[PDB]
Amino acid sequence: HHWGYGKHNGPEHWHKDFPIAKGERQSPVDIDTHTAKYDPSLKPLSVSYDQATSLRILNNGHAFNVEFDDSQDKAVLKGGPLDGTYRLIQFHFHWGSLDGQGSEHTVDKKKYAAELHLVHWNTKYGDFGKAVQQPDGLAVLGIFLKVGSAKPGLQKVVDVLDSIKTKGKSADFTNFDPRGLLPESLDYWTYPGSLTTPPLLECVTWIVLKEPISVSSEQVLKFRKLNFNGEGEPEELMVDNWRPAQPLKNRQIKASFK
Numbered sequence: 001h002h003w004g005y006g007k008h009n010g011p012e013h014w015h016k017d018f019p020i021a022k023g024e025r026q027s028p029v030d031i032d033t034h035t036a037k038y039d040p041s042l043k044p045l046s047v048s049y050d051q052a053t054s055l056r057i058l059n060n061g062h063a064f065n066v067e068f069d070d071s072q073d074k075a076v077l078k079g080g081p082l083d084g085t086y087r088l089i090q091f092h093f094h095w096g097s098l099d100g101q102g103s104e105h106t107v108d109k110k111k112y113a114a115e116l117h118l119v120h121w122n123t124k125y126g127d128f129g130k131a132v133q134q135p136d137g138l139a140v141l142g143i144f145l146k147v148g149s150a151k152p153g154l155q156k157v158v159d160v161l162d163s164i165k166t167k168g169k170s171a172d173f174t175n176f177d178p179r180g181l182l183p184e185s186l187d188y189w190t191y192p193g194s195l196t197t198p199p200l201l202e203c204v205t206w207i208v209l210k211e212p213i214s215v216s217s218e219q220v221l222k223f224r225k226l227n228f229n230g231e232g233e234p235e236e237l238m239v240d241n242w243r244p245a246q247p248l249k250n251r252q253i254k255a256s257f258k
């Protein structure tokens with residue numbers, strides 16, 4: 001009876017195994033755009049993904065994860081609110097059963113169809129496993145997805161999903177360029193938070209881009225053909241794999257713009 005995204009094991013139950021679920025800096029949150037403080041001291045975000053090297057793709061029963069070779073100083077996030085340099089390790093998405101829900105963060109209560117998380121670890125802690133034990137260990141770049149015109153840079157992902165339909169399946173997935181997942185503008189909101197899945201560690205500086213990417217109805221319909229279950233178990237479609245907004249508590253969300 002492990003954690004998941006149903007009635008008996010979903011977000012409202014996670015606190016029993018992971019009591020930090022009711023902590024002071026949990027994610028995601030609603031971003032109240034009026035309340036967010038413009039911070040002129042914030043820097044432009046530096047995203048340097050030209051040398052990113054992807055390794056594979058896995059359905060872990062919770063999402064699909066595209067994992068990168070992070071053993072050299074390649075694909076790095078820096079600037080913005082960050083001190084030092086954070087190296088890309090993986091990305092994944094959260095999405096809904098319908099286009100009107102799926103994102104983790106919300107913007108003035110608006111839910112997007114999905115949300116992409118690019119996960120990076122602070123190089124000062126040597127690898128991801130040590131970084132998650134630190135308050136400034138991770139930087140996650142979050143990008144909203146709305147449904148409209150296709151995202152041509154997503155299609156290579158979408159077309160491999162058929163090979164990783166069920167929990168535990170993986171594939172080789174090389175030469176995927178995550179620059180094709182970025183919107184035009186790097187304007188962002190930032191605040192201190194957590195992983196959005198167990199173990200819910202409070203290790204993340206969140207950087208959430210204001211401009212969403214557009215993906216097509218057909219692209220998100222293929223996300224919703226994945227399964228939570230393993231091969232040969234009753235089919236439960238992988239949909240609604242998002243945590244709802246959590247209390248903001250002490251925190252201030254800062255804006256890089258306006």
Ligand SMILES: CNS(=O)(=O)c1c(F)c(F)c(SCCN)c(F)c1F
Pocket residue numbers: 063065089090092117119128138140194195196197
């Ligand atoms: C914020 N979204 S999340 O679901 O909590 C999440 C993941 F799914 C991840 F896969 C990772 S990286 C896991 C391999 N290094 C992560 F840091 C992470 F934060």
Ligand code: NA
Pocket residue numbers: 045046047048
């Ligand atoms: Na840069």
Ligand SMILES: [Zn+2]
Pocket residue numbers: 092093094117196
């Ligand atoms: Zn995530």
